[PDB]
């Protein structure tokens, strides 16, 4: 199928750097695949509105045509980022902000949203440093990407993963959430 | 005290820009106060580092020294911002981001984190188009900034103030919601100090 991912890190040779290369590597060759890196890109994550120019047009913003294209195109999307402050690096935030607008992501009904992106699936893979006890009593944590960004936009099912205690553990431990990751995508 | 308005929306006419509005025009006399405007700023989001730029040296980053000036500067943080998405526009996000970072915000202990910032108190004022009583159910919704946020960077009081179904209310309940504002702000006061 068509993949997209789409990889949010500054430094190339991070781990989440490792991440991408493991997802692209055991990707079968059936599928189709594009990767855009945020960073690389110099996306611009900073959305504007104005009467001059009109939050109704979002949808219709030369600059995000690309990705807007790209989203479309895309039968799976698999995000990679590291959790900082709870969330989603603030490239990626914007990326969402700027590009999953009204009329292209969703559309407003009577009562809540209406989700455009339908037959479309996702996997999120994040890093962090917070034990995995410690997971159910905190928020968001890719959570807020899965169940109330991904979602509402019609978009499923989406697979969550999180790699724990990311700094915590040894290179050897890494190695082995490196080799799942790669298993995982294998399986697709 | 001192108080820094830190204030998010890319239109001057916004909603939001009325809020903004009446906390300026509201605050005290006796404060000394300075707004930041980070759509006016326009300031960079995007937090970069590298083999080059080491994280270690993050608060040592030469265009963000004026934001960091400004937090240390600061006795009372009042965040004023749309809902996007369940949580802070982009550019606020890289805010905290950039600003809030290791060796200045907080730092390690020998098991978890030490806030570097107290002394400071705050407050957060949002708007969306979600019912208020779903609030206790969705994650984030200024949550994160109020509890994973400032509270680990020891920032005590946070006051959380979420203006809710607030496209689908009228324009008087907005204007009541205006007033609610404004008083609050009144009562941004030192202990035993009365409004200038
Ligand atoms: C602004 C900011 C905010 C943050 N807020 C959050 C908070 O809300 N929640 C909390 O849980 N965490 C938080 N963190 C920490 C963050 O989640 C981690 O730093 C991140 O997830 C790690 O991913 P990375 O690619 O950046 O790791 P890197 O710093 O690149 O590397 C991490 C570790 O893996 C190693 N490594 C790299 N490649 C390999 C390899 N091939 N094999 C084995 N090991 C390898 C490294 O050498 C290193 O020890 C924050 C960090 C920042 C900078
Ligand atoms: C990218 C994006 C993502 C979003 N994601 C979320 C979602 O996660 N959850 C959901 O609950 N919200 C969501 N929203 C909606 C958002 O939170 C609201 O649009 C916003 O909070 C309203 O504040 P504003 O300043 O932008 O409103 P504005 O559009 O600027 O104005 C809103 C209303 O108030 C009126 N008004 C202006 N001034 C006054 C005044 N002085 N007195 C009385 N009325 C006045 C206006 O004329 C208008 O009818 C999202 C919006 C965007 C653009
Ligand atoms: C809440 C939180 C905030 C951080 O800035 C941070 C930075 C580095 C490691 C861990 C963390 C963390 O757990
Ligand atoms: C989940 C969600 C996403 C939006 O983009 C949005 C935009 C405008 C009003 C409400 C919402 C909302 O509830």
Redesign the pocket.
């Given at each position: 199928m068509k993949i997209l991912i789409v990889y949010t890190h500054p430094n190339p040779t991070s781990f989440n750097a490792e991440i991408l290369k493991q997802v692209q590597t055991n990707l079968s060759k059936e599928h189709t695949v594009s990767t855009l890196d945020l960073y690389a890109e110099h996306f611009d994550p900073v959305?504007q509105?104005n009467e001059t120019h009109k939050?109704r047009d979002?949808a219709k913003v030369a600059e995000m045509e690309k990705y807007r294209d790209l989203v479309t195109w895309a039968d799976h999307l698999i995000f990679i980022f590291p959790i900082w402050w709870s969330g989603m690096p603030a490239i990626l935030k914007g990326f969402?902000?700027?590009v999953?607008?009204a009329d292209f992501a969703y559309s407003y009904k009577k009562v809540g949203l209406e989700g455009h992106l339908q037959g479309k699936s996702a996997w999120i893979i994040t890093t962090h440093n917070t034990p995995s006890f410690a997971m159910p009593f905190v928020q968001d944590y890719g959570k807020v990407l899965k169940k109330?960004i991904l979602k509402p936009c019609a978009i499923s099912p989406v697979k969550l993963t999180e790699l724990t205690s990311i700094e915590k553990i040894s290179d050897d431990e890494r190695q082995k959430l490196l080799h799942k990751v790669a298993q995982i995508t294998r399986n697709i």
């Open positions: 959305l509105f939050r979002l969402i902000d700027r999953f607008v109330q």
